[model samples]
Target: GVFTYESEFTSEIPPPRLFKAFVLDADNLVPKIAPQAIKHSEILWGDGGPGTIKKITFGEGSQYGYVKHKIDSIDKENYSYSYTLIEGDALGDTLEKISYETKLVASPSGGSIIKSTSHYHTKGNVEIKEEHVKAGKEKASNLFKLIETYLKGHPDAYN
Candidate 1:
């Protein structure tokens, strides 16, 4: 069995629209805003719906990898999306058989909460520990914050 790691981030942005923008428009817009972290991203096939494939390349010294992910499922009514990483990145042949899910929920106060969980099997000589988990969490948090800041400064950008 593979171990699970999770992280959560909350923002003042509204859930319904923000969730859609993050899951749908993000592939085309995120790199433009945070080019330092995300070099670029594009959809290889399909639209923003389930079964869509996206190739993402991270900045140098920051993973410096690419991953082709296929949407496994999505529940718009529930604001949840799940995908399986099919290729690329550092995940070894066996470890690449991993799945990640991200969910956006409408907070009680009208904001949004984003939660991410990863399920992956470890490979030889690769250790899954707290340090790695913490790093992943911090990176995710930073990315969300970057997006939030960008949206705030560019009001009509993602709209």
Candidate 2:
């Protein structure tokens, strides 16, 4: 079986509530923060909860064309989420599928531990495993840093 590539990161964001909102509010926050990578996100069906469908489009310089994913699970209180990219530019008109899981846990120092897993299968000339994992990790780190900086300026934003 092709297991997923995993990446984990720890940040100084101590509040789980903030992290939960960050993960669940992907539709709005991601597009706003990483406009180049995430152009827009819209909920096609469901209550923005588990089994929800979302269409995410990328801007210029994107690796693939676009992506449509389904919310596999969402645990708001636990700060955990999972989604599968079932279609779009990333798949390149193939039968590839990409799935990801994200979890935010409490760190030993009361900070936050962010873990992400990406599972992908492709049928063509695309290398979508380790390279994608590395790229995603770096991007995730940058995104979190942006969030941290934003919260620093707006203390009441996440609260």
Query: Candidate 1: where are CA atoms >4 Å away?
Result: 61-64, 92-94, 123-129
Q: Candidate 2 — which pairs collide?
A: 65-89, 66-89
- Global CA lDDT computed for model 2: 0.69
Residue-level lDDT of model 1, residues 25-136, one tens digit each, is 7776667767766678888868767788888887767546777878777767777778877776556444656687888786787677888787776665455556665676
Candidate 2 to truth, TM: 0.79
Q: What is the lDDT of residue 114 in candidate 1?
A: 81
Ten-residue region with minimum lDDT total, candidate 1: 88-97
Instruction: TM-score each candidate.
Output: 0.79, 0.79
Candidate 1 TM-score, true structure as reference: 0.79
